[PDB]
Amino acid sequence: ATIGRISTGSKSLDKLLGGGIETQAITEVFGEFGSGKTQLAHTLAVMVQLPPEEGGLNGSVMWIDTENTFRPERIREIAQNRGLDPDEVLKHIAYARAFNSNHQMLLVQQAEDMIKELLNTDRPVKLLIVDSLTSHFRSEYIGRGALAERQQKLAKHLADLHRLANLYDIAVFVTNQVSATLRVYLRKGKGGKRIARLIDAPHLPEGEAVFSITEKGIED
Numbered sequence: 001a002t003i004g005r006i007s008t009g010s011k012s013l014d015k016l017l018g019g020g021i022e023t024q025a026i027t028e029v030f031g032e033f034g035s036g037k038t039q040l041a042h043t044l045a046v047m048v049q050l051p052p053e054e055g056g057l058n059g060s061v062m063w064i065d066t067e068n069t070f071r072p073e074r075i076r077e078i079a080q081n082r083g084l085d086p087d088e089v090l091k092h093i094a095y096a097r098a099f100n101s102n103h104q105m106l107l108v109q110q111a112e113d114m115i116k117e118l119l120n121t122d123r124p125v126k127l128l129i130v131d132s133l134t135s136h137f138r139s140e141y142i143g144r145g146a147l148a149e150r151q152q153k154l155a156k157h158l159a160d161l162h163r164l165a166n167l168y169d170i171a172v173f174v175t176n177q178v179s180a181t182l183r184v185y186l187r188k189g190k191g192g193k194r195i196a197r198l199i200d201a202p203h204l205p206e207g208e209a210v211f212s213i214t215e216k217g218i219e220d
């Protein structure tokens with residue numbers, strides 16, 4: 001299938017990314033507290049439900065939350081400020097809390113079931129979010145005696161996610177803190193704006209995009 005792209009809500013950021021985040025790819029967004037990475041996740045979970053003309057893929061969402069950062073009220077706000085029905089938008093985000101790193105890996109394995117069910121419907125899964133990719137791994141695998149296993153498990157987890165992305169034409173979006181992934185780094189800019197910097201993309205030039213966080217989620 002042709003690679004599809006989901007608008008981030010920001011024209012500037014979309015331009016940096018070659019049009020939006022890609023299906024058949026993992027986009028990995030880094031940022032310190034308040035960087036905007038979870039706001040970007042929330043915005044994408046709304047945008048993907050729009051038709052292509054409006055920057056979406058007429059899709060459903062699956063969301064794995066490791067640290068209780070998903071806010072349904074924020075989804076409702078972004079949805080309504082963009083013209084969608086807030087209840088319908090929430091209904092099409094399948095939510096799962098991951099309690100630990102093993103559970104997180106199991107959930108990705110389990111997600112395939114729902115992806116298969118929705119695949120040839122009017123709302124196939126088009127976005128799978130893991131927020132955040134590493135919080136449990138960081139918490140559980142302490143020190144050098146644990147590094148080897150941590151990297152192995154994380155590598156397997158990323159491979160599972162890549163497989164879902166490629167096989168089912170899904171954009172995988174994961175957050176992290178400092179290929180395989182398209183890495184974007186968020187930071188505070190001037191006057192409450194945020195800056196995204198794209199780094200080490202094989203076929204997109206590095207660059208920066210400045211964006212805002214509003215009641216619409218993120219936009220220029």
Ligand SMILES: Oc1ccc2ccccc2c1
Binds near residue numbers: 064111
């Ligand atoms: O109800 C469910 C079950 C499994 C899941 C796996 C990943 C994300 C959401 C999910 C929601």
